[PDB]
Design a protein around this ligand. Structure first.
Ligand SMILES: CCCCCCCCCCCCCCCCCC(=O)OC[C@H](CO[C@@H]1O[C@H](CO[C@H]2O[C@H](CO)[C@H](O)[C@H](O)[C@H]2O)[C@H](O)[C@H](O)[C@H]1O)OC(=O)CCCCCCCCCCCCCCCCC
Ligand code: CLA
Ligand code: CLA
Ligand code: CLA
Ligand code: CLA
Ligand code: CLA
Ligand code: CLA
Ligand SMILES: CCCCCCCCCCCCCCCCCC(=O)OC[C@H](CO[C@@H]1O[C@H](CO)[C@H](O)[C@H](O)[C@H]1O)OC(=O)CCCCCCCCCCCCCCCCC
Ligand SMILES: CCCCCCCCCCCCCCCCCC(=O)OC[C@H](CO[C@@H]1O[C@H](CO)[C@H](O)[C@H](O)[C@H]1O)OC(=O)CCCCCCCCCCCCCCCCC
Ligand SMILES: CC1=C(/C=C/C(C)=C/C=C/C(C)=C/C=C/C=C(C)/C=C/C=C(C)/C=C/C2=C(C)CCCC2(C)C)C(C)(C)CCC1
Ligand SMILES: [Ca+2]
Ligand SMILES: [Ca+2]
Lengths: 56, 95, 243, 169, 60, 450, 37, 119, 176
């Protein structure tokens, strides 16, 4: 599916989504916050904070 | 392609009062029917023939006479659950 | 719900819970060979929901998937009236009659698909094996029940298309109005299978409780798509009138 | 103008099919609401062929008869209306058939009134339709004026009308 | 019974004359020597009329 | 004091501001205005009595004061039938005459009485900065307010009672013998969420709670009155508040805005202090009544209303609340928190009870539901009843609609007035209510923002 | 309606409640007489 | 002030006598057993349901009765209602003994009220 | 009559969906906002130029100096809202500009409607709804409202057309 960053999350242990699916083909798993979505949102927030620090 | 109700309107159902499918408002034209006799008829559906409407258990002599008088207005079709499910024969959402 | 009042019950979720009998209960309800007994307040409380996912490969096991209810504590059948008849051989036949015998339920599955289905016990006739002279912990009422279309024939889709009401064509596209398959709405009467494993009988008061598992199709949206297979596991309770 | 030409053809003694077959496809194409410049949208872009498609051929003139032989006229869609109810009137302007929205108190549907359509001229010349689905489809077409077969594949036409260069100008 | 009607009509008339006179008398500091006793008398008579109306209510 | 712009600094359109420091004139204005209030009470009561057809319901005749008297238990019997019309007349007459007296006094103080009272008496003379005197006036009026609450209690308990719409055997005027003094109930009312199903204090649903809460209110008010007579404001209050006549006005304006909003909600939702016998149904009541009316009709027609599913798949007549309770179906699902004397007999522990619905519905409940459904609080401004698309032949607007709309509007404009006077009081205390001083314009001594 | 003895002043009670509106108007009359000082 | 029973005044009483007799029959049959079964919900529902017109009906008996029997019937109905209210109170607090006492009280006062009924 | 014209344009033209009308609405509401905010800002940054509580007579038409503090207003709005006018001339030109441009844009949209060149539909959502009976947006709901208005209003609004719409052809929801 041309997924470029998803394998890099999965390599280090982030393999589940908030939608219940996991790249191991399983379902119903609870990753907690550290799902694919959680990691992506953390990066977005980090980007904002770094931007503000750069401005300062 | 007609869904199923329009196909019923192709039949005798769309021409007169069906004892298996008509809503209770459709009986108001028959004097002395709505609501008691009409509700009794709808409760005791289905009918294979129009004549077994006279065999409603517990029917009354005046009701017997009225049903005989208005036998002409009645037809029997296959009871379509489209028209029947949810007590739509009693209240099809029309006021 | 125990023995409270509505003031105690309101906004608690107890209203959606079928009553339980007791713990020190291993009684049996004696029945006559060929008489029928009324069931007073029959309740079913679902607790587990599974939808049979459809693989795209072929020919491979489909593996029921656990869903989660998006609708709230609105999932229980109750105040159902019925009857249990004892056959000549000893068969026990459970017949649903009326009551709050349906609830629309929407479950979310992993992947984001939401599955509404018409959870019901309507017109359920179920039977045990012959040679039952009692209702006890081995009584299994396995039978069939009807599943009406989730949406009634008075429903209108977002384009005001329906079965006995609404448009029969895509009016927003005047030159392509009659082109769409969803222009025809359908309400097939689907079919379900249910089993009612009685696990607890208090013959003094006539209450019976047990477990159930039901199999039935999901919403088709007036025939828009093929129904999925939904499995419901839960518990049930009812009073059987001995006299 | 089309009706006048057909009436002259009939007044000589031509039959319905011949008289209507004398009508050029160009005049009939002018008599079609999808060619009115007051049917488009501000953001429905491009050629009118991107709307209903490329017109292929005139289907011929439909004539609607109910079960009792009354000749019915389908009320045409005005320029104002994005959508319009299907109504059939007889000679003296009385509704004799329609397509009901609610069916439980339906009285004048194509199904109950037994409306049938026969075509004269064009692609469907000499054919008659009694299946209410076909009759309803052709009544919906007749709402738009003269009916035409369209190539919707070439432009991937979407089904909503465009305005003409007259309207854009 | 006509006495009650007369008393109530008199009370309305006296209410009108009080409503007119009171603000003028309170807002004419020059003519306060002879309008203060008139105010006292009028208040007394108005109260008397109200009492009479109240009694004739039960008397009629 | 002056009576024009040069000598007061206030234009005519703010002329009442000239009264801020003329205590006698201010007292006259207040007493005369109180006369206006009492005059309206009496005159409106007499108008309503004159325009009252006593065999037609109160809410059908645009009456807002007579229901208040009826709720207090005067002139009505079971189901709210008007027994004696004289007590309504007496309430109106007494208010009218007393308004005459109050107006006389207000005119005296406003026009001839002493301009200021401070050199006349220390007791009645006041200064806005005199914190002890202001708390004294608070104390006196708190004692009076507690006494009025106790008057309500005494009427309900020892003077014939109040109208109880929840009375067994039918709504009736009954004497409250056991008010709930239990502070758990009384003050847990104040802690209930102001949202659906809780209804912070709007949900009080029995006259025992109302009377007991009024006993508590009377005691609280009297004790606070004594407390304020015998003390002066503490340091924290002194450091937190603006101490000026306009500041006190603004505080009262905020309080009044709050009370106006509360009253509008109260009349819209509560059918205990506002019995539907006199005020007509609430909107929730009318919606539930329509659902009940068609459940009853269709059930008589033979519909099995427990199992009838509507077009969407939800039960047409009955369904579950999100917490599982059995409730009326349709749009009235939003109104399942409604409780009414005509509907609770059909309610079981789980909500609406199928057995009661199938065999316990009384003809009087059917009549009541039809009446409430057809008197839903919907109506046009020119008093055309029903939904707005209805035609002109039904002259009805619910008294609940009039009271709720009027008091929401008054609450809003008194919030506006509170903002106006609070801001003005602050600015005047700090001394820039007349504009920025060019010499000492504060922003000119501030660092630039960026 | 009003008790029977009082219904000759029925057309007077018809206009009583509207008086405070007249008081509000009278304020402006008084200010107009003084020239809106 | 006829002060005597007559054929036609009895018919005018009857329009209210029928529901009150039905209510008394129900009070003997169903409400007693509801109290006995310790069923407070249904006790309250009964006294607010099928009884929800008892005040109107019995004040109709009283107000439209003989000049001797008017005030007496009114007072008797009032006492019945007081017992009904105390019944509601004893049911809301699950007071079986007090509720049974009040039920006997309401029955006795109702029987006294129907005692002064011609025919 | 104007109200009828307004509702007619909603039902037949979907005029609310028209971007030119939305720019008109933006201009008119912005003009009202500018009027209110400018009036209040001026009235609440006035210089103390008189001794009366009545600040209205502390102004003279021939006075050369500003009657309110532009600097204070600018600081207030910069700290409250983030930005503020600093040029009086730009401020008043803006107060002219906003409502006038709103009127001109709405007039352009009306010119479009004169030829039935409407922003009536979003074709992608129409197609999806036609093939997906579970796709519902506020746009499609508004389309349904327009259909209802047209069918119910046309016979009385356009009497010369002799529209005869039998009761059964009228669109309507359940129970209504
Ligand atoms: C300074 C302090 C600021 C304080 C802030 C705290 C929040 C305040 C606002 C609360 C917002 C509530 C939203 C939902 C309101 C609601 O669910 O409903 C309203 C509730 C009442 O709740 C209802 O109470 C009812 C009680 O009736 C029940 O009991 C009755 C007994 O007779 C009947 O039996 C009835 O049938 C039965 O249902 C029911 O429980 C309803 O379900 C329940 O919703 O009001 C209430 O509780 C509270 C009163 C609300 C006042 C109205 C808002 C005022 C807003 C002014 C805005 C002005 C702006 C100016 C700007 C410039
Ligand atoms: C706590 C902070 C934090 C955490 C937990 C993560 C976590 C993650 N990041 Mg991320 N990231 C961060 C901060 C963080 N990041 C910051 C600040 C940036 C901006 C630079 C990024 C930019 C970023 C990108 C572009 C990507 C990620 C990705 C990821 C995911 C996979 C990472 C991976 O493959 O490792 C790889 C890291 C290495 C292989 C490190 C190599 C370092 C070299 C070998 C060492 C250099 C020489 C050494 C210093 C000298 C010798 C010293 C020695 C002797 C000790 C993972 C969930 C990937 C992803 O999945 O996308 C969603 C992805 O592509 N991140
Ligand atoms: C008045 C001149 C005019 C007219 C009447 C037409 C008419 C037509 N052209 Mg055309 N064209 C023109 C000029 C014109 N053109 C110019 C100058 C060019 C060079 C770019 C073109 C290049 C062109 C191409 C490539 C094509 C056409 C096509 C067409 C046909 C399709 C119309 C269409 O969908 O447009 C759609 C119109 C709109 C969607 C309206 C846009 C409104 C904008 C957004 C207004 C902007 C608002 C503004 C920012 C507000 C300011 C803010 C405020 C503060 C001031 C049509 C008959 C098509 C065709 O079918 O060819 C065979 C086609 O392929 N034209
Ligand atoms: C108890 C409540 C109360 C009290 C005692 C005051 C007292 C005062 N206010 Mg105030 N105010 C209040 C509530 C109150 N206000 C509310 C709720 C608002 C919000 C609207 C305001 C907004 C307000 C403003 C803007 C100002 C005052 C001012 C004043 C001072 C002089 C006002 C004056 O002379 O009246 C004069 C009376 C009039 C000019 C007549 C006004 C008529 C109104 C606008 C319409 C009446 C409509 C009514 C519903 C009847 C409808 C009639 C219909 C039939 C046509 C004065 C001390 C002034 C001030 O600040 O002084 C320093 C001043 O500028 N108030
Ligand atoms: C409830 C409404 C109300 C009340 C109680 C007052 C009260 C008062 N105002 Mg005021 N005012 C009001 C509304 C009110 N105002 C409104 C709406 C406006 C805007 C137009 C004003 C504008 C205003 C200004 C500019 C001034 C006042 C002033 C005053 C004070 C002096 C009165 C005076 O000398 O005038 C004299 C008027 C008369 C002598 C005419 C007659 C007045 C009487 C009372 C009429 C009563 C008629 C009644 C029906 C008769 C019944 C009598 C009895 C039998 C019951 C006074 C306490 C003055 C002040 O502040 O003093 C320092 C002042 O300068 N007001
Ligand atoms: C809250 C309203 C109020 C207030 C604070 C005042 C205050 C005052 N008045 Mg006034 N007055 C009022 C209303 C009010 N009055 C009314 C409605 C009228 C019309 C009847 C009058 C007519 C009036 C006149 C003619 C005079 C005053 C005078 C005075 C001043 C001296 C009071 C005094 O010592 O005499 C003595 C006080 C008493 C002996 C106490 C008696 C208390 C009352 C009368 C008995 C009823 C108490 C009641 C049970 C309490 C609750 C009331 C109830 C309605 C709830 C004083 C500042 C005098 C003045 O200004 O001096 C130059 C003056 O001559 N008043
Ligand atoms: C109208 C009646 C009234 C008025 C005007 C006052 C006025 C005053 N009282 Mg008070 N009081 C009253 C009635 C009144 N009291 C009664 C009836 C009692 C008996 C219980 C008391 C007992 C009392 C005490 C013990 C004290 C006062 C004090 C005060 C002074 C300052 C208090 C303050 O800032 O208020 C505002 C309150 C606060 C700033 C505290 C914040 C409270 C919370 C956080 C606000 C949240 C409210 C919430 C949004 C509303 C929801 C409603 C409900 C659910 C809670 C002030 C002049 C103080 C004083 O100085 O005494 C001399 C003081 O110590 N009073
Ligand atoms: C640097 C220079 C380039 C600048 C570009 C600025 C771009 C702006 C964004 C584009 C705006 C226009 C896009 C329209 C949508 C679109 O895709 O159209 C795409 C259309 C083409 O449309 C295509 O046509 C094809 C057939 O050729 C097919 O039919 C396709 O189905 C159809 O999509 O292109 C145009 O129509 C351009 C001509 C537009 C002029 C007609 C209107 C004339 C009157 C205008 C009055 C305006 C008044 C404004 C007043 C204020
Ligand atoms: C200044 C103060 C002036 C007046 C103060 C109030 C006086 C009220 C006294 C009347 C009480 C009734 C006496 C006879 C009687 O027992 O009830 C006779 C009737 C009916 O009241 C009946 O009383 C019986 C007594 O055993 C029983 O309790 C009955 O249950 C009860 O219905 O009451 C009335 O008709 C009078 C109406 C009462 C309304 C008065 C309240 C408002 C009064 C003044 C408001 C003025 C405000 C100015 C500011
Ligand atoms: C073209 C191309 C290329 C290039 C590329 C590039 C170079 C790019 C890029 C890119 C990028 C580089 C992107 C990015 C991004 C981003 C984002 C998307 C962000 C964000 C963010 C946010 C949103 C934040 C926010 C915030 C803030 C701001 C502050 C506070 C906090 C917060 C969070 C709120 C190459 C060579 C490859 C080749 C091919 C072609
Ligand atoms: Ca029908
Ligand atoms: Ca009159």
């Amino acid at each position: 599916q041309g997924m470029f960053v998803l394998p890099f999350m999965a390599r280090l242990g982030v393999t589940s989504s908030w939608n219940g699916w996991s790249v191991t083909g399983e379902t119903g798993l609870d990753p907690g916050f550290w799902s694919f979505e959680g990691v992506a949102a953390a990066h977005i927030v980090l980007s904002g904070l770094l931007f503000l620090a750069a401005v300062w | 392609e007609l869904n199923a109700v329009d196909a019923k309107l192709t039949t005798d159902f769309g021409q007169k009062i069906d004892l298996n499918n008509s809503d209770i408002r459709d009986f108001r034209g028959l004097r002395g029917f709505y609501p008691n006799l009409a509700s009794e008829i709808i409760k005791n559906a289905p009918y294979d023939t129009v004549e077994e409407v006279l065999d409603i258990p517990g029917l009354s002599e005046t009701q017997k006479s009225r049903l005989e008088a208005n036998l002409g207005s009645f037809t029997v079709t296959e009871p379509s659950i489209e028209l029947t499910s949810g007590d739509d024969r009693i209240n099809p959402g029309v006021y | 719900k125990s023995q409270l009042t509505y003031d105690d019950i309101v906004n608690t979720g107890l209203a959606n819970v079928c009553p339980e009998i007791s713990s020190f209960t291993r009684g049996t309800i004696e029945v006559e060979p060929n008489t029928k007994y009324f069931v007073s307040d029959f309740c079913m409380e679902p607790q587990e929901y599974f939808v049979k996912e459809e693989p795209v490969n072929k020919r491979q096991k489909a593996e029921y998937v656990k869903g989660k209810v998006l609708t709230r504590q609105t999932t229980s059948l109750e105040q159902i009236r019925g009857s249990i008849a004892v056959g000549a051989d000893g068969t026990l036949t459970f017949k649903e009659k009326d009551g709050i015998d349906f609830q629309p339920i929407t479950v979310l599955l992993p992947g984001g698909e939401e599955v509404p289905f018409f959870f019901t016990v309507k017109n359920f006739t179920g039977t045990t094996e012959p040679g039952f002279t009692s209702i006890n912990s081995s009584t299994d009422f396995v039978g069939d029940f009807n599943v009406p279309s989730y949406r009634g024939a008075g429903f209108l889709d977002p384009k005001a298309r329906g079965l006995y009401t609404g448009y029969d064509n895509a009016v927003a596209l005047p030159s392509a109005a009659d082109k769409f398959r969803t222009n025809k709405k359908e309400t097939p009467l689907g079919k379900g299978t249910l089993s009612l494993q009685v696990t607890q009988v208090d013959g003094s008061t006539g209450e019976i409780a047990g477990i159930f598992e039901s199999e039935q199709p999901s919403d088709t949206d007036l025939g828009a798509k093929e129904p999925l297979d939904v499995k419901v596991r839960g518990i049930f309770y009812g009073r059987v009138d001995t006299d | 103008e089309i009706q006048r030409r057909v009436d002259s053809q009939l007044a000589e003694g031509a039959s319905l099919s011949e008289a209507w077959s004398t009508i050029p496809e160009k005049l009939a194409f002018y008599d079609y609401v999808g060619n009115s410049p007051a049917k488009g949208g501000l953001f429905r872009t491009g050629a009118m062929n991107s709307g209903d498609g490329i017109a292929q051929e005139w289907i011929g003139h439909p004539i609607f008869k109910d079960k009792e032989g009354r000749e019915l006229e389908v009320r045409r869609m005005p320029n104002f209306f994005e959508t319009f109810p299907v109504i059939m009137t007889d000679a003296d302007g009385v509704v004799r058939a329609d397509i009901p929205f609610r069916r439980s108190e339906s009285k004048f549907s194509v199904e109950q009134t037994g409306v049938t359509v026969s075509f004269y001229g064009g692609a469907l010349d000499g054919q008659t339709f009694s299946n209410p689905s076909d009759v309803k489809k052709f009544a919906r077409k007749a709402q738009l004026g003269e009916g035409f077969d369209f190539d919707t594949e070439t432009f991937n036409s979407d089904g909503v009308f465009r305005t003409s260069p007259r309207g854009w100008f | 019974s006509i006495v009650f009607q007369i008393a109530l009509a008199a009370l309305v008339l006296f209410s009108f004359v009080m409503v007119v006179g009171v603000p003028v008398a309170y807002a004419s500091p020059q003519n306060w020597d002879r309008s203060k006793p008139l105010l006292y008398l009028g208040s007394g008579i108005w109260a008397i009329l109200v009492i009479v109306v109240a009694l004739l209510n039960f008397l009629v | 004091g002056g009576r024009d712009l040069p000598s007061t600094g206030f234009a005519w359109w703010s002329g009442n501001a000239r009264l801020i420091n003329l205590s006698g004139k201010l007292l006259g204005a207040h007493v005369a205005h109180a006369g206006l209030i009492v005059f309206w009470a009496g005159a409106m009561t007499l108008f309503e009595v004159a325009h009252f057809i006593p065999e037609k319901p109160m809410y059908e005749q645009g009456l807002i004061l007579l229901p208040h008297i009826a709720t207090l238990g005067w002139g009505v019997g079971p189901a709210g039938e008007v027994t004696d019309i004289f007590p309504f007349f007496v309430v109106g007459v007494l208010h009218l005459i007393s308004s005459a007296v109050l107006g006389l006094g207000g005119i005296y103080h406003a026009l001839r009485g002493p301009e200021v009272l401070e050199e006349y008496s220390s007791f009645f003379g006041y200064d806005w900065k005199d914190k002890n005197q202001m708390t004294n006036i608070i104390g006196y009026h708190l004692i009076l307010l507690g006494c009025g609450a106790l008057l309500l209690v005494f009427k309900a308990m020892f003077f014939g009672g109040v109208y109880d719409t929840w009375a067994p055997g039918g709504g009736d005027v009954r004497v409250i013998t056991n008010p709930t003094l239990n502070p758990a109930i009384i003050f847990g009312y104040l802690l209930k969420a102001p949202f659906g199903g809780e209804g912070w204090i709007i949900s009080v649903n029995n006259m025992e709670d109302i009377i007991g809460g009024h006993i508590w209110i009377g005691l609280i008010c009297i004790s606070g009155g004594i407390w304020h007579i015998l003390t002066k404001p503490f340091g924290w209050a002194r450091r937190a508040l603006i101490w000026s006549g306009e500041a006190y006005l603004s505080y009262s304006l905020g309080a009044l805005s709050l009370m106006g909003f509360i009253a509008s909600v109260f009349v819209w939702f509560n059918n205990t202090a506002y019995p539907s016998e006199f005020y007509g149904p609430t909107g929730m009541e009318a919606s539930q009544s329509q659902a009940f009316t068609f459940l009853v009709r269709d059930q008589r027609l033979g519909a099995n209303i427990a199992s009838a599913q509507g077009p969407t798949g939800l039960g047409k007549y009955l369904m579950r609340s999100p917490s599982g309770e059995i409730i009326f179906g349709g749009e009235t699902m939003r109104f399942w928190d409604f409780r009414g004397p005509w509907l609770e007999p059909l309610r079981g522990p789980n909500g609406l009870d199928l057995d009661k619905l199938r065999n316990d519905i009384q003809p009087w409940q059917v009549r009541r539901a039809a009446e409430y459904m057809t008197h839903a609080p919907l109506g046009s401004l020119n008093s055309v009843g029903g939904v707005i698309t209805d035609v002109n032949s039904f002259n009805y607007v619910s008294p609940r609609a009039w009271l709720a709309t009027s008091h929401f509007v008054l609450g809003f404009f008194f919030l506006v007035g509170h903002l106006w006077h609070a801001g003005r009081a602050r600015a005047a205390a700090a001394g820039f209510e007349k504009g920025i001083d060019r010499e000492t314009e504060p922003t000119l001594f501030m660092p630039d923002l960026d | 309606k009003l008790p029977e003895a009082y219904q000759i002043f029925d057309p007077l009670v018809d206009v009583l409640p509207v008086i405070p509106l007249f008081f509000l108007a009278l304020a402006f009359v008084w200010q107009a007489a003084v020239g809106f000082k | 002030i006829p002060t005597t029973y007559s054929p036609e005044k009895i018919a005018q009483l009857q329009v209210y006598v029928n529901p009150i007799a039905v209510a008394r029959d129900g009070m003997e049959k169903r409400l007693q057993g509801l109290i006995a079964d310790q069923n407070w919900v249904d006790t309250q529902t009964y006294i607010h349901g099928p009884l929800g017109q008892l005040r109107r009906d019995m004040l109709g008996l009283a107000s439209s009765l003989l000049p001797k029997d008017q005030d007496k019937a009114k007072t008797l109905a009032k006492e019945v209602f007081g017992h009904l209210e105390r019944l509601d109170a004893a049911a809301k607090d699950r007071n079986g003994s007090q509720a049974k006492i009040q039920y006997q009280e309401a029955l006795a006062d109702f029987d006294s009220f129907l005692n002064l009924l011609p025919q | 009559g104007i109200f009828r014209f307004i509702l007619f344009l909603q039902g037949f033209h979907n005029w609310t969906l028209n971007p030119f009308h939305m720019m008109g609405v933006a201009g008119i509401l912005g003009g009202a906002l500018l009027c209110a905010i400018h009036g209040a800002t001026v009235e609440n940054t006035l210089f103390e130029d008189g001794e009366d509580s009545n600040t209205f007579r502390a102004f003279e038409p021939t006075q050369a100096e500003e009657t309110y503090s532009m600097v204070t207003a600018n600081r207030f709005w910069s700290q409250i809202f983030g930005i503020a006018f600093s040029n009086k001339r730009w401020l008043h030109f803006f107060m002219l500009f906003v409502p006038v441009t709103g009127l001109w844009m709405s007039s352009v949209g009306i010119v479009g409607l004169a030829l039935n060149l409407r922003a009536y539909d979003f074709v992608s959502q129409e197609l999806r709804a036609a093939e997906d009976p579970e796709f519902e947006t506020f746009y499609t709901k508004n389309i349904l409202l327009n259909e209802g208005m047209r069918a119910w209003m046309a016979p009385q609004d356009q009497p010369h057309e002799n529209f005869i719409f039998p009761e059964e052809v009228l669109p309507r929801g359940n129970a209504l």
